[PDB]
Ligand binder design. Structure first.
Ligand code: IHP
Length: 113
């Protein structure tokens, strides 16, 4: 999916990743067993990575605006939740809040004009 994102099929990659995250969340909900602890942990890490890629691609395509910020914050909060001990997810979430607040400042300045 990442490769096909790199191969100019960006919107298709984003849609496929939406579907994949939904499917894998359903699988994780269905994955309820004692032996499945390590597999569930790996799947949670994969969900974190998928959500991080979701946010990155959402910014790459739709940019940053009033509509995009809630969705991307949801994606990054989910990514942090699935894998709390991951540096990339937390850094992406924090810098995303940073970008959102700077964008709010800039549009406020535009309003002032
Ligand atoms: O183990 P991978 O499947 O290769 O995933 C990660 C990660 O990939 P994702 O962000 O897509 O999960 C990084 O991001 P990408 O470059 O793959 O987009 C990647 O590279 P960076 O950390 O430099 O972004 C990083 O390391 P690598 O460059 O060696 O692929 C690698 O983690 P690992 O290095 O632990 O395998």
């Amino acid at each position: 999916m990442k490769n096909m994102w790199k191969s100019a099929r960006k919107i298709d990659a984003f849609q496929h990743m939406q579907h994949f995250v939904q499917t894998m969340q359903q699988q994780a909900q269905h994955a309820i067993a004692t032996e499945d602890q390590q597999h569930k942990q790996e799947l949670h890490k994969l969900m974190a990575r998928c959500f991080l890629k979701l946010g990155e691609w959402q910014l790459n395509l739709q940019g940053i605006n009033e509509s995009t910020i809630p969705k991307v914050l949801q994606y990054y909060s989910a990514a942090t939740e699935h894998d709390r001990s991951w540096y990339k997810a937390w850094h992406a979430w924090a810098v995303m809040n940073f970008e959102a607040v700077l964008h709010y400042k800039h549009q406020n300045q535009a309003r002032d004009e």
